[PDB]
Amino acid sequence: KADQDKMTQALVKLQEEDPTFHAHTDEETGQVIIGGMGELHLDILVDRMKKEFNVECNVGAPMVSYRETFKSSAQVQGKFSGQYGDVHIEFTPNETGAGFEFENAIVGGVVPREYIPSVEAGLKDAMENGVLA
Amino acid sequence: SMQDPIADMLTRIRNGQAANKAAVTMPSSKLKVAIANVLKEEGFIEDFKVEGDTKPELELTLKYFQGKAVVESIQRVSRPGLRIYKRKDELPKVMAGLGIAVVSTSKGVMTDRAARQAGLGGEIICYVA
């Protein structure tokens, strides 16, 4: 973390010297992305950062944006147990690029309508955080 | 013990006035007599008398104007624990001048007004309203 602070300062100074060099921290990943006109251009700047500013850092290709999906369909029951909550949801894989689809198929008030938005919110939050990586 | 005699005199008057006692009697002393004269001259007490030689006793005759004590309150300003001395300009005023303050000036014990007229400051013995 100490090297991060030194790195930030080093990056600023290098950016001041070279406007074609762009260094910015990805807010999502927390990774610092460096942009340059060449691989050597970046390598020099990294080397400068290590030698001039004594900053130990590891340089790699930026992680690509990744998304998860389901391959198979399944019916699952989520029960929370006073505090009580019981839901039965069927997950099916959608066509590529079709996006997310939620269907409320509750009939006869098996689940109160007041709690349906809560179920949706729970699903949506969990989906955003993913299941694998 | 009786470390302050004067306080006892004032207390006896106050307690006597509360109890609707016609007269209050205490062991006489020169200062007590002097304070009594001031009260009589200001009309707070009707009359005072001293009896006995070896052991004189001062009797103060209390007065009630309308079945109510003429002396509404009497308080010892200067005490053995803490003595209070005032310059002539700093002499106290009681009840916006309606009350009297007994001051021991060099010439003698006198009301605050009398001392202020004289232009001599003194120790403030008590406030009587």
Partner: protein, 121 residues
């Protein structure tokens, strides 16, 4: 207390320590946000309240509250903090100032603009 006793030992006033230690008698102090996170309020209040851990120039690290709707603050952002404790948030004794340093004014604010560092339309 008798006079003689008071002469021997005088009456003493309370220490009356301040409730904003980190500021150290400074109207504002500057700090870098080590972490920005949301914390739940104490009862009986329910919300997600945005807070940041800021290491000040004085060197004290204190939780500070990011007021208004929305924030651009992330780790390593430089902000200016002012005194002011959040009742329902324990350990929050400071507020971040919108419109100072890296902190940006609240968007779509047409009232109390000075408080939320929003320039006049």
């Amino acid at each position: 207390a008798t006079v003689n006793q008071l002469v021997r030992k005088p009456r003493a006033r309370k220490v009356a320590k301040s409730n904003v230690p980190a500021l150290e008698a400074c109207p504002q102090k500057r700090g870098v946000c080590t972490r920005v996170y949301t914390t739940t309020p104490k009862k009986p209040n329910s919300a997600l309240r945005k807070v940041c851990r800021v290491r000040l120039t004085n060197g004290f690290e204190v939780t500070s509250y990011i007021g208004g709707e929305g924030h651009n603050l992330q780790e390593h952002s430089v902000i200016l903090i002012r005194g002011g404790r959040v009742k329902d948030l324990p350990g929050v004794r400071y507020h971040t100032v919108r419109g100072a340093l890296d902190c940006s004014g609240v968007k779509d604010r047409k009232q109390a603009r000075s408080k939320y560092g929003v320039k006049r339309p």
